[PDB]
Amino acid sequence: GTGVLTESNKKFLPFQQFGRDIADTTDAVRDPQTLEILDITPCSFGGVSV
C-alpha cells in the first residue's frame, strides 16, 4: 500500500492485527517484527484547477 504510517492511540486487542474504518479499508497495521500499531493514512491528494 501507499500511505503515511503514524503513531496510533487505538487500543488493539492482542489477537487483532489489521484495522478498518467505516469503508472496510485498511486503516492500521500491526507489524510482526515489532509489535506496534501503525495507523495508515492515504497520502495528500486533490484536484488542481487552473
Tell me which residues touch ligand NAG (CB under 6 A). Answer: 32-34
Distance of CA 42 to the CA centre of its chain: 8
- Distance, in Å, from the CA atom of 45 to the CA atom of 21, rounded to the nearest integer, reads 19
Report in angstroms how near the CB of residue 46 gets to ligand NAG at its nearest. 38
Nearer to ligand NAG, 18 or 21 (CB): 18
CB neighbour class for 22 (10 Å; exposed up to 12, middle 13-18, buried from 19): exposed
Nearer to ligand NAG, 4 or 5 (CB): 5
Nearer to ligand NAG, 14 or 47 (CB): 14
